[PDB]
Design a protein around this ligand. Structure first.
Ligand SMILES: [Zn+2]
Ligand SMILES: [Zn+2]
Ligand SMILES: [Zn+2]
Ligand SMILES: [Zn+2]
Ligand SMILES: [Zn+2]
Ligand SMILES: [Zn+2]
Ligand SMILES: [Zn+2]
Ligand SMILES: [Zn+2]
Ligand SMILES: [Zn+2]
Ligand SMILES: [Zn+2]
Lengths: 242, 242
């Protein structure tokens, strides 16, 4: 088919009599709509440990944001489109600021940055195998997670030496320059519960380094689609570049 | 002389016409009072890179909190005791909740803990040599900093193997269980400016381990006097155990 690329859409649900703590119901519903047309396709996903997507409720109307780094997978579904019914599918920025698509080429075209600010809309956490969970805006973990996602999914990965150079630059010269409205959360992400933070955080390069700045710009742009950290398929790590 | 031990005192200043942003003036004043009696003793301190104390302004009245892990050094000074005059010296908990003394033996007698909460009243930061500054409540850094201070100043240090065991336990099993009212700051600490955080943070041992729990209790108690992290002589790292 045509070239795959990252995409985000916002599903607008309106409920006549909504439950008490609606966000929790994100999973049950997404599948319901998905299963309504194609019970079959819903199955592989509920079953799969291969989750090639992020799904998170936004903070009577409930908005569920879905993103993927591969266009192709949810295209048919997008074509198809309690007391919650589906009022709108917003697949454009015009429809919703958190919806839209961007090519990998465009992401690569992203302007270089000395500083990069992120708004973490849903609890965000980092998983390190020892599994340790870090619910803090560690600059190295934020950038490293984004770089992991880029290398895993981009058609334009950095080569090993570029990658290692970037990681060492991050380790050496990337600081958290500030944070705002930081809050601790503990939420269900799949079967278990995990700690995470929300709020805003700003990363800064101590360094003047073109390579690093360009990388930072690209990774900052990627976050809109990829999210940050662990459990992104389960509503966690929704991170908007500012 | 008599056995040295940690001590904290709160100096109560009252200013008829206070400056705009009073806390900044903490250093200039502490010396002034100190120099008023003994210009000579003030000198070694302004000069010394050996700062065996912490000094921080509390958040017309300005309160300056002074602590030491060695009683002996500021005893003579304590005996002696803008439009700011010194109204009171509070050297007891009865006088002020953040003043008082505790023996090393008592600190050792501290009850074991699975969880330990700290209130960071002044911006707190960790220095790691690569110098990297971490203005976040990293559990390993909090506990490691406190253990550093204990080992450096206690008459009852852990032996090398005990210490290493503790550090590995912290690395493996210590989590940040929560945080409240976290805020980012950038403040002058001596000659330069440094980032730091304030707020409350709670550490939790995943582990049931008597050794670790006892250590956590002792370190949690020590913080009242030692502070946490870097630049404690310069108003930073004021951490109250809760
Ligand atoms: Zn389910
Ligand atoms: Zn282009
Ligand atoms: Zn755990
Ligand atoms: Zn992936
Ligand atoms: Zn992929
Ligand atoms: Zn001075
Ligand atoms: Zn006793
Ligand atoms: Zn620096
Ligand atoms: Zn020391
Ligand atoms: Zn000492």
């Amino acid at each position: 088919g045509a070239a795959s690329m990252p995409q985000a859409v916002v599903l607008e649900l309106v409920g006549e009599k909504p439950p008490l703590y609606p966000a929790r119901y994100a999973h049950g519903l997404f599948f319901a709509l998905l299963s309504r047309v194609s019970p079959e396709l819903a199955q592989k996903l509920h079953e799969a440990p291969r989750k090639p997507f992020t799904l998170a409720p936004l903070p009577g109307t409930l908005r569920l944001r879905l993103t993927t780094l591969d266009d192709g997978l949810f295209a048919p579904f997008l074509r198809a489109l309690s007391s919650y019914r589906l009022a709108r599918v917003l697949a454009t920025r015009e429809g919703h600021p958190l919806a839209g698509a961007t090519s990998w080429e465009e992401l690569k075209e992203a302007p270089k940055r000395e500083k990069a600010t992120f708004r973490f809309l849903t609890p965000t956490v980092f998983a390190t195998s020892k599994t340790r969970y870090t619910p803090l805006p560690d600059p190295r973990l934020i950038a490293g997670s984004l770089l992991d996602k880029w290398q895993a999914h981009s058609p334009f990965p950095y080569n090993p030496k570029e990658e290692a150079a970037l990681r060492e630059l991050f380790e050496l010269d990337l600081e958290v320059a500030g944070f705002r409205n930081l809050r601790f959360h503990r939420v269900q992400a799949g079967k278990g519960f995990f700690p995470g933070f929300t709020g805003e955080a700003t990363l800064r390069l101590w360094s003047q380094s073109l390579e690093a700045q360009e990388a930072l710009g690209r990774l900052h742009a990627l976050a809109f689609f990829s999210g940050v950290g662990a459990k992104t398929p389960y509503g966690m790590g929704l991170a908007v570049p500012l």
